[PDB]
């Protein structure tokens, strides 16, 4: 069946028409087809898929955030890779390009003119703005007005020209349309080469896409985080931050993830790169970066389990939410953010709730249906910690969660001081909350750990109503791991490979998602 596609501008509309005509020459072999819908911006494209007018359109990782928000509700299905087809990369480098011998550095951008790819895009706004949000003079909200005062002249595609005149000083009206002269990676580089802006925030591959001569590329330099400048060719050693790649999004329910991937896997072979001379999916004479990014070298399927907030990751989802709210993290106060424990069954959150009250609110309970579900919550921020067995720690570990405590079963004089090898049950947690989990749970040990059999009168933490409600019942104490142990460092070496081989045949939806990027 045909899948409707969204096009922005007249230029991308003609590229869509050619995407239709060229496709039906070897199509349909089984079913796949393509349609075209004309919209003014990407915002119009995300809203159109939600009203079943279109079905798929490619978006920037930072624009993916806007797509999964209500009422758009769109999850990434097929993500494009950068580099080569042999060795694919799921993350591109966001960098800052400037002219040679300008004087300006990363810290000294105030008063300078800027050229951005598009408001809310990864390389263009969030990576570049992101570091400056806490250095920006108050008020921080709105964020757009602060950038309108920091820089002297700026061009931000997709930005309200009536509310923020200064933000469209370089490109009047601030067209999100392909047609505007400064739009996209190559559009901000054209805002720089022409001499309109002093700096352009783009992808590392933007310099090659616009200039082919190596002598002409030497006239430009790349800024580095440590207020230094380096050759454009050295993108790996000097760049701002690593962001997830551009991806096509469709509805969570009724978006046919399989009908779009079957179309894209076939659009790459027939009219993709180094395959045909008549039609290319990553190059067009009518415009650059149409439909897909020219820098892309193919497509890759997005696991079923992996949702938008899992595709971007805690590190990036939290940076966008803090960027739009204007929240800047102060030097750690060691006050300790309330801990969010994850319960699985009815019996778990009933012992948890009795524990939440006894802990004077230092521990709270979040409920999830399955064991893998809890692991997902700790990831995006909905939960903080849970106890897991040796097999699951290896699954969670491959996701990005390092364990900090281990359940010891052998009673001794110094239980917390000396941990046991075994593998035993480990309390996995997130990178940041590792400090408090390490401290709050250690405070409950002196309060509800090893206690006399007075439980009916007083609460006991390791005793359960049935068997192993949160922690295992035969546990004496939660051992503190002094070494910075990961999933590999806690599970030895022989056991690590053991569970890796067995997960090869018996594969879960959580494992294929965390091992995707």
């Amino acid at each position: 069946k045909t899948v409707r596609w969204c096009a922005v501008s007249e230029h991308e509309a003609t590229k869509c028409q050619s995407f239709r005509d060229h496709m039906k020459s070897v199509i349909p072999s089984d079913g796949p087809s393509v349609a075209c819908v004309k919209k003014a911006s990407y915002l119009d494209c995300i809203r159109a898929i939600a009203a079943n007018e279109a079905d798929a359109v490619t978006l920037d990782a930072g624009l993916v955030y806007d797509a999964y928000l209500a009422p758009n509700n769109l999850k990434p299905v097929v993500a494009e890779f950068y580099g080569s087809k042999e060795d694919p990369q799921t993350f591109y480098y966001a960098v800052a390009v400037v002219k040679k011998d300008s004087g300006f550095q990363m810290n000294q951008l105030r008063g300078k003119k800027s050229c951005h790819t598009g408001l809310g895009r990864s390389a263009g706004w969030n990576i570049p703005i992101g570091l400056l949000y806490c250095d920006l003079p108050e008020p921080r909200k709105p964020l757009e007005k602060a950038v309108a005062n920091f820089f002297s002249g700026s061009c931000a595609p997709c930005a309200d020209g009536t509310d923020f005149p200064q933000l469209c000083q370089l490109c009047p009206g601030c067209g999100c349309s392909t047609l505007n002269q400064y739009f996209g990676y190559s559009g901000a580089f054209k805002c720089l080469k022409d001499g309109a802006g002093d700096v352009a925030f783009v992808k590392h591959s933007t310099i090659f896409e616009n200039l082919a001569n190596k002598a002409d590329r030497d006239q430009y330099e790349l800024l580095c985080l440590d207020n230094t400048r380096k050759p454009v060719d050295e993108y790996k050693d000097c760049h701002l931050a690593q962001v997830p790649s551009h991806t096509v999004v469709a509805r969570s329910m009724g978006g046919k993830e399989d009908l779009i991937w079957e179309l894209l896997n076939q659009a790459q072979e027939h009219f993709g790169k180094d395959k045909s001379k008549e039609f290319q999916l990553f190059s067009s004479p009518h415009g650059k970066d149409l439909l897909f990014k020219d820098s892309a070298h193919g497509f890759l399927k997005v696991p079923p389990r992996m949702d938008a907030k899992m595709y971007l990751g805690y590190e990036y989802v939290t940076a966008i939410r803090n960027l739009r709210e204007g929240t800047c993290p102060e030097a750690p106060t060691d006050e300790c953010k309330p801990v969010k424990w994850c319960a699985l069954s009815h019996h778990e959150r009933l012992k948890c709730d009795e524990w939440s009250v006894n802990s004077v609110g230092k521990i709270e309970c979040v409920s999830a249906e399955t064991t893998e579900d809890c692991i997902a919550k700790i990831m995006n921020g909905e939960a903080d910690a849970m106890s897991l067995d040796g097999g699951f720690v290896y699954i969670a570990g491959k996701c990005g969660l390092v364990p900090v405590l281990a359940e010891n079963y052998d009673k001794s004089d110094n239980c917390e001081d000396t941990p046991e090898a075994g593998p035993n049950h480990a309390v996995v947690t997130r990178k940041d909350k590792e400090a408090c989990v390490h401290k709050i749970l250690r405070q409950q040990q002196h309060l509800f750990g090893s206690d006399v059999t007075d439980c009916s009168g007083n609460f006991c933490l390791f005793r359960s109503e049935t068997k192993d409600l949160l922690f295992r019942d035969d546990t004496v104490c939660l051992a503190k791991l002094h070494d910075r142990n990961t999933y590999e460092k806690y599970l030895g070496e022989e056991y690590v490979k053991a569970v890796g081989n067995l997960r090869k045949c018996s594969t879960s939806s959580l494992l294929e998602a965390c091992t995707f990027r």
Partner: protein
């Protein structure tokens, strides 16, 4: 077009050009010099304020008129005398200019025992039984009504209220004061319903009213009484050394009160500025207008701040370009001296019209009384709104921000009965707030004939600045509440409130296990509530702020929280204050614990059959509020 910071600065500029002192003084002129409720001078100011609202060119300005019953001291003045065991003897003590409204007015005679403040705790620590005698107490620890209510509980005959020198450093010791003994709010002769000629005013009496006669007396009169009494008062109470514990077995006191009722014409003057996105939703701002005395502090400042805030927001919309999302209503209540009557008859009158339309009430009464510290009592749904405003507004005297106590959320105290915000939060279920630039010791001439403008401007030199600081705080509550799509109500602030309740109740886990009871259900009730808000928070985070439709379905769920804590098991006529957390009576969470405290002693004071029901309804009131907050009617797991 205009944002918060562009609004904060635009307000501040308007505050700087606004002269408050001149306004408070113009409200204390000869023509408003006497301001009793329903008097011609009361209506005079009513017409002034109404005409002033119209002069500001507001979107609409209307008035409601009620015919409530108050109580006044007639030609037959009340008197307090000491008598002999066989009959009337000795000497007269005082004739009181100031009376207590809702007074029994029945002549009584008996031993006089000092109950101190009249607190429920004060009566338990008394070595002298009050069973069948007249009690004397010092005002300002508990509302006048509660003093009497507490005395009538241990079977008292009468109540004498005086102002000691320690708590009230006043020079004139012959000064009398006013107040009401009605435990509750609104017209007591029309409880539950409005005082509109429509109801035909049927014979209905409020359970608030106390049979026992109450009278206020000056410091000099109580001193005279102590002369006839014996027993030195405990150093536990910071009081005068004049204070005496009980009367001599030879002579006792005889109080005779004969206050008559009076039907008056009360006027409530309103004004409204319609919002631009959702006009049907509004925040209400009120302020008391009537006063027994001159009331410069009691209502002068309030009505002054109300008129000016109405002006400043009128000028911000008309000239500045302020475009509010939700409407704002300015209210001048009358009969406030008798228990927030004017405001309560309004709530009991259009309850259905402001059901889930009014999402917050801001009170301006007694905002300026001191200069030392900043005090504010309100509904937790306003805590975060206050905390951000506290660290934004600067104190009028010291150049520092108002936000200095980090753990100030914990130090806040429940709203009291005498406050005009009480009816809104406890009866209506409308988040309410009442801030004050209070003093460590309450205002001495609060209910006297010395509440003049001169007295106020002398105790607070920089009255203009404190009034402007005050108007800035209430001004930011509105700008925040109507400004943007997000509603400044923090439903997550109730987690701490519930955690506090369950923890206090957990202390008695031994008495719960002794009875056929388990506390596990209250744990899950509070736990499910936290999940409900957390899911609501994430729901706000995972939605497009610019989409009108999805924000409305979330803000409507936020407003409902205030309503859901109003018990659905009590009759709104007999127990008006239904709110579980801030209302009155047995159903409330505090009453559940108060009843259980009697179980610990193994006395017959504990009603077991009552507790089992207090627990069940409150367990489910918290659960129902939880289920209704998240998961829908089918997405709910337990």
């Amino acid at each position: 077009r205009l944002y918060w910071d562009d609004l904060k600065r635009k307000l501040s500029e308007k505050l700087d050009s606004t002269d408050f002192t001149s306004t408070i003084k113009l409200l204390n002129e000869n023509s408003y010099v006497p301001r009793e409720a329903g008097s011609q001078k009361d209506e005079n100011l009513a017409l002034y304020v109404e005409n002033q609202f119209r002069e500001f060119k507001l979107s609409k300005v209307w008035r409601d008129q009620h015919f409530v019953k108050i109580q006044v001291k007639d030609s037959a003045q009340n008197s307090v005398i000491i008598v002999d065991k066989n009959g009337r003897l000795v000497y007269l003590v005082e004739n009181p200019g100031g009376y207590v409204a809702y007074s029994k007015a029945a002549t009584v005679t008996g031993k006089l025992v000092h109950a101190n403040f009249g607190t429920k705790k004060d009566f338990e620590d008394l070595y002298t039984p009050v069973n069948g005698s007249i009690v004397i107490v010092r005002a300002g620890k508990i509302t006048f009504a509660e003093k009497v209510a507490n005395a009538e509980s241990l079977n008292a005959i009468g109540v004498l209220i005086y102002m000691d020198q320690t708590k009230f450093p006043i020079v004139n010791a012959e000064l009398s004061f006013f107040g009401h003994a009605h435990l509750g709010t609104g017209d007591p002769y029309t409880p539950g319903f409005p005082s509109f000629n429509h109801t035909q005013f049927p014979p209905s009496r409020s359970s608030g009213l106390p049979n026992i006669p109450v009278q206020t007396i000056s410091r000099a009169a109580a001193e005279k009484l102590f002369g006839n009494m014996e027993g030195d008062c405990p150093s536990d109470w910071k009081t005068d050394s004049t204070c005496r514990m009980v009367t001599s077995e030879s002579k006792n006191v005889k109080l005779t009160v004969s206050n008559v009722l009076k039907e008056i014409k009360i006027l409530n003057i309103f004004g409204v500025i319609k919002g631009f996105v959702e006009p049907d939703h509004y925040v209400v701002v009120g302020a008391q207008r009537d006063a027994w005395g001159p009331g410069a502090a009691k209502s002068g400042v309030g009505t002054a701040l109300l008129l000016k805030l109405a002006q400043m927001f009128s000028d911000m919309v008309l000239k500045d370009g302020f475009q509010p999302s939700r409407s704002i209503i300015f209210a001048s209540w009358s009969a406030g001296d008798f228990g927030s009557v004017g405001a309560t008859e309004w709530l009991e009158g259009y309850l259905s019209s402001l059901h889930l339309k009014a999402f917050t009430y801001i009170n301006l009464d007694k905002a300026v009384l001191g200069t030392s510290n900043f005090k504010v009592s309100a509904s937790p749904l306003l805590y975060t709104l206050i905390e951000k405003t506290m660290q934004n507004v600067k104190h009028p005297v010291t150049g520092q921000f108002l936000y200095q106590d980090s753990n100030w959320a914990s130090k806040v105290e429940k709203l009291t009965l005498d406050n005009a915000a009480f009816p809104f939060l406890a009866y209506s279920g409308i988040p309410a707030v009442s801030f004050c630039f209070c003093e460590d010791t309450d205002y001495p001439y609060l209910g006297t004939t010395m509440d003049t403008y001169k007295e106020l401007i002398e105790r607070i030199p920089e009255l203009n600045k404190v009034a402007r600081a005050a108007a800035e705080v209430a001004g930011q509550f509105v700008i925040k509440l109507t400004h943007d799509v997000e509603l400044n109500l923090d439903y997550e602030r109730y987690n701490s409130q519930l955690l506090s309740f369950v923890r206090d109740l957990n202390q008695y886990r031994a008495d719960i296990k002794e009875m056929g009871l388990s506390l596990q259900w209250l744990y899950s009730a509070r736990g499910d509530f936290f999940r409900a808000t957390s899911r609501l928070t994430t729901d706000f985070g995972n939605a497009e702020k610019t989409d009108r439709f999805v924000m409305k379905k979330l803000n409507d769920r936020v407003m409902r929280v205030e309503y859901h804590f109003l018990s659905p098991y009590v009759s709104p006529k007999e127990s008006p204050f239904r709110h579980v957390f801030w209302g009155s009576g047995s159903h409330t969470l505090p009453a559940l614990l108060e009843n259980l405290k009697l179980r610990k002693q193994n006395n017959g004071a504990f009603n077991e059959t009552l507790f089992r029901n207090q627990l069940a309804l409150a367990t489910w009131t918290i659960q129902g509020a939880a289920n209704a907050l998240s998961g829908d009617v089918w997405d709910i797991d337990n």
